[PDB]
Symmetry: C2
Subunit: 50 residues, 2 copies
């Protein structure tokens, strides 16, 4: 019973609102890279230079 909501989708919509294209993604090897894969897989569909 994962009480925490899936944050992957939330952050993906915010970067789309500000219309970013070239940023830096500082990640810690702690909470998992599930939010890192989500933006790395989407780094090809919507182009980004992350």
């Amino acid at each position: 019973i994962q009480m925490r909501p899936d944050l992957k989708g939330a952050l993906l919509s915010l970067i789309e609102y500000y219309q970013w294209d070239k940023f830096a993604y500082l990640y810690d090897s702690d909470r998992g890279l599930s939010t890192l894969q989500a933006v790395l897989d989407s780094a090809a569909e919507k182009k980004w230079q992350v």
Copy 2:
């Protein structure tokens, strides 16, 4: 006692050999992401577009 040698240094030295600057890194989550962290952390040290 890990029999398999570390590949992280080897691949980085070959990419530096072919002198690549923009490539595609198709990784599978199966064998881990230790090599994925090696290219991502070295993506900034040499300024690549992965």
